[PDB]
Write a protein that binds this DNA or RNA. Sequence first.
DNA 1: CGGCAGTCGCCGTCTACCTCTCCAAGAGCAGC
RNA 2: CUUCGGCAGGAGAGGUA
DNA 3: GCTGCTCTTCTTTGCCACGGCGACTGCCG
Lengths: 97, 146, 244, 1121, 49, 97
Amino acid sequence: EVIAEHPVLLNRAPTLHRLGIQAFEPMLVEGKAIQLHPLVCEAFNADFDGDQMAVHLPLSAEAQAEARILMLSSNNILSPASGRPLAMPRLDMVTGL
Amino acid sequence: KRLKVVAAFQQSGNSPMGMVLDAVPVIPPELRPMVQLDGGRFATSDLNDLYRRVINRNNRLKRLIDLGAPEIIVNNEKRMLQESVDALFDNGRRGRPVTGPGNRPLKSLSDLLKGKQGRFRQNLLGKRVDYSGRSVIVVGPQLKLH
Amino acid sequence: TGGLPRVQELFEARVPRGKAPIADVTGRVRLEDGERFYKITIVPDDGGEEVVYDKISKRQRLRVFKHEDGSERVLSDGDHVEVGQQLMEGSADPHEVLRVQGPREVQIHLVREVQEVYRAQGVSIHDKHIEVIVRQMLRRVTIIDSGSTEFLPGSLIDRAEFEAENRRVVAEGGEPAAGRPVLMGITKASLATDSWLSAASFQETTRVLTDAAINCRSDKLNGLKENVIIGKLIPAGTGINRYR
Amino acid sequence: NSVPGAPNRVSFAKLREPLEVPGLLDVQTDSFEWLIGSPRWRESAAERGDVNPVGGLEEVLYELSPIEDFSGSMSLSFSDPRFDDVKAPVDECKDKDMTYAAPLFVTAEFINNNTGEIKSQTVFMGDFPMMTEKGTFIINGTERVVVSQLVRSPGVYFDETIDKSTDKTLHSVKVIPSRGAWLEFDVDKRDTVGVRIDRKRRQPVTVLLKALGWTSEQIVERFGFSEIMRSTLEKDNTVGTDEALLDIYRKLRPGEPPTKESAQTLLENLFFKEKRYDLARVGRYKVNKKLGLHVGEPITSSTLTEEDVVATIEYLVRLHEGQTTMTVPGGVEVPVETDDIDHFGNRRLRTVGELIQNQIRVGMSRMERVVRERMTTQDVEAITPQTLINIRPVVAAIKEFFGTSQLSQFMDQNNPLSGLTHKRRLSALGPGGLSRERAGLEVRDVHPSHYGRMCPIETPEGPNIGLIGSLSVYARVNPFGFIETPYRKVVDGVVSDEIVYLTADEEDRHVVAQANSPIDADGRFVEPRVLVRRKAGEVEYVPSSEVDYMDVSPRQMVSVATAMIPFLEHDDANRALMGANMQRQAVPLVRSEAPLVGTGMELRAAIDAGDVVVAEESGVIEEVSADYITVMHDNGTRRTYRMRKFARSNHGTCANQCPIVDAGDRVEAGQVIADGPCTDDGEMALGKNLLVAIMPWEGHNYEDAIILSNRLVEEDVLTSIHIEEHEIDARDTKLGAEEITRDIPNISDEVLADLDERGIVRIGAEVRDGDILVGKVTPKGREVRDTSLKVPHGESGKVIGIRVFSREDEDELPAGVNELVRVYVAQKRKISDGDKLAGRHGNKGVIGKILPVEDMPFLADGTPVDIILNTHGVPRRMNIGQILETHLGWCAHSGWKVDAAKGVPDWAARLPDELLEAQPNAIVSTPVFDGAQEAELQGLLSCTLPNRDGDVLVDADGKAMLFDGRSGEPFPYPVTVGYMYIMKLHHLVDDKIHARSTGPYSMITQQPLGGKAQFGGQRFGEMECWAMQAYGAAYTLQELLTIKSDDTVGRVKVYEAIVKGENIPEPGIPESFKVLLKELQSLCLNVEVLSSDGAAIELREGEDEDLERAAANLGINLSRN
Amino acid sequence: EFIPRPVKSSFREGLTVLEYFINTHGARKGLADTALRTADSGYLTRRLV
Amino acid sequence: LDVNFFDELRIGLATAEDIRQWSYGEVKKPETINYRTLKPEKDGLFCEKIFGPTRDWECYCGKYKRVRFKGIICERCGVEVTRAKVRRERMGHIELA
DNA sequence: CGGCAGTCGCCGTCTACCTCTCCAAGAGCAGC
RNA sequence: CUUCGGCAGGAGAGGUA
DNA sequence: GCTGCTCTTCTTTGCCACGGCGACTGCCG
Ligand SMILES: Nc1nc2c(ncn2[C@@H]2O[C@H](COP(=O)(O)CP(=O)(O)OP(=O)(O)O)[C@@H](O)[C@H]2O)c(=O)[nH]1
Ligand SMILES: [Mg+2]
Ligand SMILES: [Mg+2]
Ligand SMILES: [Zn+2]
C-alpha cells in the first residue's frame, strides 16, 4: 500500500534517443529479476540474454507529475524522428497474426 | 594577430603585470587529503609533494641569498625554482615530467580540469544518485503497457 | 562506415578531397585539351576577366549533366554554361557555392548532400531535423572595413550585433560597416559562444580559460549547460516563466 | 585408444591419424627447463643436433662477466649456478601465504693482475620462484600464470610506399636492433639516398661510406651501376673521411666539443661496440640470411659489421632499380623482395623463460654498476668477493616482475577448461608490444600464415579482439622462438610416414596438399589433380607430380576449446567464436554426467589439465575410502594418494575429487583413479542432457528467453556449491592492543549464542546477514569499543571451516599483527529465474519461467519435455548444428539397428562396423571436420528401436506429436524433439541485484560512492541528461542533480520531510561547483559570483541550527542498540 | 577486394577446411567495428548536441 | 544563499594583492603530519593555525573543548575555536624570494 | 627584400556495469 | 535532556550487454 | 658502537597511431 500508484523510471544504456527512459507503475513479484513488457523492447533495444537496467524513484510532487504525465510509457508510441509507430507487434506476434 | 592581444589588454582596466608572479596560493587541505594504507604507510597525494619541492627550493634560495653567495649559484637556484613552479602548475609542458614511485608522472593542478576524467566532464555534467538500483530483466507477457 | 566520413566532412564544412570546380560566369566554354590538364578557361558572355581553371589531372571524369539543349551529354569545346555548375565530377565546395550562388543555394546543397547518405541505407529522417543544424551553421559575418564600429577587420561577429552597431553608427554618423556572409563548422562555432563556462566544458579547457582570463569575460548564465552546472531550472519545458 | 582405461565411445570418422596429439603443457614447462638447465633439457637437446648446450642463467652470467675497472688491474667473474631444495611444499605455501621458491648460489672469483692472489667463494643471490608440476607459480599464496608475448623480430625490413602527387614508388630500409639505436636509409622525391640516423637529420649516404673508409675510387667502381648512386655521389660535397666524420659528429649533437678523439669514439661506440648495440642471435641469424652474408659458420659476436651496412644500401638500390635478384661478393643468390611485418616468419614468441631472463639480466646490469664503483673506494688486500656484490637489485627486480606486472596474471579457475586455456595463450600486448588504441586494423586480422599455428576462431570480442589468441593443437616452438607445425612428406606421388616440422618461411616455398585427399591404400593419390596451398595463400589445382607435403590431419588448424564443438562446419564464425568462449564460463555441477554426442577431445583435455588423479605405476589396489586410495605396486612398495574435498577455487567455485575404483581392481600406469570438478569417468563434462522441444510457447520464450521444467529443481539437476572466505586481524593500537573475546560491551545475550569460548562461530551454524563472526574490541579515545566481523549484506550460508594463526604460537605473521582468523561459508544454489544458460553452438538466454510438470507438453506415452526453445532465432543466426546435434542425440539415446538382411543399404556403405547396431543410452563421437554426413543422419533417423511398448514416437523427419498440458487438445502439427547438451554459466541473478536509499559518501566531492561492494549509487551520465532535457522535465532533473547527489544541507531535510510526512523543501547549492571555484582560484584565476548590482556574493556556508532532532543515521552508517 | 575463389557449399552440407578458413576474414570485420568505430558516431553526436 | 539570485560569473587575472587578500597565513615548512602523534605540524601544509581546527570546538593545546568558548583565539597555540568544516574553504600562500 | 614550403607541435578519438591484486628504499644521524 | 568515542585514494589485469 | 628515526630523489642507459590545423623559420630566389 505504500508502493501503490507511485511511478518509477527505467533506463538502459546506451541512451541513444529520448525514449531510452520511460516511467511505469510498479508491481511486486517473487524473484530477483525485473519483468518488462514485450512491446517496449523496441525503444529500449533490449533482448533477454543477459541485459540489465537501472531503476530510479521520483520523490517530490512535481517530479511525480512529470513522470506520470510527460514520461509515461503509454503516451509515447510514435517515433519523434519520423512519426512511425514503435510499440507495435513484431517477431512472434507478426507470425501469429 | 598582435592587436588581438594589445587591444584586449588596453580596453579593460587590467594590467599586463599578471603573468609574472610574486606569491603562490595553496589549496585547502581537505581537497588534497592523505589516505592510510593497511594502517601502515601513507599512499601519497600527488599534489602535496609539488608544494614540498616549491617550499624546499624557496628556503634554499632564501638562505643562499641571505648569506651572500656568488651570482652563479643564485642564478642556478632561481632556474631550479622556476622549473619547480612550472611543474606545479602544468607538469610535462616543457621538458621531462616530474616522476614519482614506479616511474609515473605526477598529477598537476591543470590536470584536475581537462579530459574525459576531469572535473568538468565527470563531476559536473554527470553524477551518482541515491534511491537507485539495478538487476536483470526478463519478459512478462501478462502486464499492460504501463 | 563509408557513409559516416562524408557526413562528418559536410558538417565540419571541410574542403572536399576530390573537389570539383564550379562555373563562375556564363558563356562559351573553352576546353584547351591537354594531357594531365583539361583546362577550361570560359571567357564571359558580355565581357570581363577569365577564370584559369587548371590543375585537374585525369583522375576524375566529367559531368554527364543534361546538356544545354534538353538532352544529356558530356563536356567538350563549345558549350554554354550557367552560373553554378559542376565542371568536373565529384564533390563541390560549399564555400565556393556560398560565395557564388548564395545562402539559399548553399542550404539546398547541404541538406540534399546530407540526406542522400542516410537515405541510401534505408533511414528516413524528416528534413526539419537538419534545417536547425544548417541554420546554426551560418549565423556570422566577416568585417572588411571598420571605421567607427571598432570591429577588428577580418573578425567574425554575429549578424544581430552587426546590424545593431551599423544602425547605431549610421545615426549621428556616416560610416556603416561592410560585411560578408561566412560558413562555420560545428566545432569552431561551438567554441565561439558567448559564455566561457560552456566552451570550457566542451573542449580545450586551458586555451579557453586563458583567453577568457586575458579578455576579462563575463557569463550571463542563460543556457542549458550553465543552469545544469550551477543548479537552476533549465529555461525549457516546465521551467520557463509562463508555466512556472 | 592409447589410454589404459578409457570408456568406449564409437566414432564416425573415416580417416586415420598418423600422429598423436602432443603434451598440451609442454610450451610452459620446456622453457622453464631450458632456463633452469635441467638434466631433462640437456637430454632433449642432445638427442637433436646441437653444437653446445648452454642454459638460460649461465648465458646471462657469461655475457656479464668479466667486470673490470678503468685501470685494468682487477676483475670479477661468475660461473656455475646451483639450486638448493624447496623450502616448503605447495600445500603449505598456499595455506600460510608464502612464495614457493628455492635458493640460488653462484661462485665468483676475484682477479688481482698485479700480485696474483686468487679469491673464490660461493655467494647467495636470493630465492628464485619455481614452477610447479602444472605450469603455474604460487606468489604470496595465489596461483599465477605467465603468458607468452607476440613480438616483432629484430632484423632488416625493406618496405615500399605510395604517393599523393608525382606517383613515384619510394623505398626504405630499417635495421631494427634489440638494444640500440635505429638506422633508416630511404629514397625520396629526387634521387637522394638519405640516412635519418638516430631518428634525426637527413644526410646523404655517400658521406657515410666515405667516412667509414670507402675511397672515392672504390665507391664509384662498385656503387656505380645506377644513376641514383652516381648522382648522389656527384652532389655529395663531401671529400675526406675527416670532413665527413666531423660533419656527422657536429650534426648529431649541435654545439658540442669537436674533438676528433670523441668523434671516432662516438662512431665506434654507436653501431660497432659491444655494450651499446646488441643484435641478438635471432636478429643476427635473420640478418645473415636475408642479404646472404656469412652462412653456417657459428653466430659468434653480435655487432653490426660494415659489410652488412654496405649490403643494405646495395640491396636498396637494386630493389629500386627493379632487378629482382642480386648476389654480394661472398654469399648465395637471394631474392630481392619486400617484407610483410605481420608474417609469422617475422614474429617470434617470448616464452616464460625469456621473460624472466630479461628481468634477471636487468637486475644483474644494475648490480654491475655498484660492483664497478666499489673498486675505487675500498683498499687492495681488503677487497673480497663477498664485499663487492649487492644482491638487493636482483631480488627487487624479481619481486617486481612476479607481482604487479602485465604478463603474470591471476589464474582463471572456473573449471579445468578455463585453466588449461589460460596457458597456451599468446598475447600481443605488454612492455614492448602494441597498445589498445595505437593498434590499427591490420594486426587484428587473420593472416594466411596463421594456418596450423594460431586458431582463427578463439579470440575475445571486446576491445581486445585480434590482440589475444590461442596456440593450435599440433604446434610447437623453435629454439629461436618461431612456431612450427608438422607435415607429412609425399615423394614421387606416394605419401610417406616421415613427419617434418616446418616454419612459415620454409612452408611458403613448397606446395602443401590437403588432409582429405583420396589415398589408394598404398600411398598413391587416386585423382591426378589435387588441391594445394601455394606461396601467397592462393589455392590452385596441380597434378600429383610436384606435391611434396601433406597435412597430418584435419582439425590441425583449430585450438583445444574449438575442437570440442560437434558439427563445427555447419556454424558461422561468430556463433562458433561465442560458443568456444562460453564453454569456459560453465560452473562445476554436483553430478556432471558426460555428453551423449561429443567429439574425441574430452578425454585428453582432462588428463592434461591436471584436475584428475592418475596412477603412476601399475599395481593392485589395497583399500579405498572417500579420503585416500592405497595402491600396492608389483615390487612391494606402497603409495597412497590424498583427495581434496570441498576446496575453494580462485573464482569461488568448489573443487572435489571422488575415487572411481574398487577394492580389488588392477590399475595400470596412466589409468585415471579419481575424478575431478567437471569430470565423469575421466572425460570432461560441463553440462547435462535435456529433452528439447523447438516451438513458440505463449510468449514466455520471446527474444531468447527460455522455459524450464520443475523437475530440474526437484531433482537438483542444475545445482552448484559456492564457497566464500572472510578474514579479520588484530593489530596493535597506540592506546593499547586489540583482542578477540566474547566480551562485547553491553549487548543482548541472544546474539552471542553461536560463539565458542575463544570468540569464534561454531562449525555447522547457519549465518544470515548481520551476524557476528569474530568478536573484536579496540581501545577507544577499560577503553573498549566494538569492531566485529559481521556477514556482508545479502550473504548467507553454513560455516564450514576456521583457521587461526597466532603470533605466540610460532607463526610468521606480518608486522604489528597478533592474530589472523579466516572463516569459510558454503551455500547450495539452485536454478531460478534470471540465471544464464547456454549450449555449445552459440545459444544463450535467460530463464524466463519455471513451469510445473503437469502443464508442460508431453509425448504420447506421457513424458514431459525439459526445456522449450524458440524457432525464430535459429535461421537468421546461421547456427544449424544444434538441430543436427538434437537429431543425433535422439538417435543415440533411443538406440538403433539398421536392417541388413539383404545386403547393406547404399547410405550405410561408408559406415564402419560396430555402428550398424547400438543399445539405448549409447555414446558416440563426431570429430570436428570428419563426422556424420546428413545422409547417414537421415538414414539412422528411420531405423530406431521402440520404447518399453511397441511404439515409435519420432517419425523419419525427427518430429513428434505433442499434447497440451493446460487444455488437453493435441497440437495440430508435429514438433521437432530430441536431446541437447546444456551448460550453466557463471552469470547468476543472485550476484547482480542491488538497491540503495542512502549510504556512504565520498570525501572531496560529497556524491555517493560507486560499486556494489559498498552501497553505491548509479551514475546519471551526460546522455541521460540529454534525454531528460528533450523530454522537458526540469524539476526531475533539478531534484536528481542537487538533492539526491550534492546538496549536503538538503539531504537531511528531505529525509526528515519524508519521514514526518510534510512537503519536500527547496534545493540549495551543490558542492562540486564550490570545489571547482576553489581550484580555479588556486590556478591564479580571479573568479567571483556577482549580483544584480555588483557586490560579489561571499558564498560562505551560513550559521545553521543543524541540530539533529531525529538521531537516526540518515544512512552513512547502520544502527546499534 | 573479392577472392576469385568462391565457396560452392552451403551451411547445410558443410564447408570444407580451406573454405572455412577463408571465411573467417569477414567475421573479424563486423566484430571489430562495434568496438572501434562507435567512437566516430558518438563524437559526432556529442558535437551535434 | 539562494541560487536564484546569482546574476553573473566573472573571470580575470589575479595579482599579488588579491592572492594575499584571499589567504589566512603563509606556509614556510615542507612538513605535513607527524608520524607518531598523527597531528599536523606547525606552519606546515596542514597547520591548524592558518587552515583551521581539526576537531569541532577544539584547540591545539586543550584549554578550550566546549561549544560556549567559540570565536576566541587561544593565547598559546593561536588557533580559532570554530567548526571543523572550515578546513575546506581556507587558503594559504607562499612568498617567493 | 620577399615570398615560401616543409615541418613540428598540440588537439581529438561511445555509454553503463562486475571480479581480482599491489602501492620506496637506501643511507646518514641520533641519544644513550 | 545521553558524556566521550567510532570511515571511503591511485595503478594494472580479466569479463558482461 | 646500538638499532630506531628521518630525510631525500640528474650520465648513461632508456627511448618507441593517425588526421587536422596553424605557427614558424631557415632558406632560396
Ligand atoms: N555503446 C556500445 N554498445 C554495445 C557494445 N557491445 C554491445 N552493445 C550493445 O549490445 C547490443 C548488441 O545486440 P545485437 O548484436 O543482438 C543486435 P540485434 O538483436 O538487432 O541482431 P540479432 O543478434 O541478429 O538478433 C548493441 O546494440 C548494443 O546495445 C559496445 O561495445 N558499445
Ligand atoms: Mg537482439
Ligand atoms: Mg542482448
Ligand atoms: Zn591552544
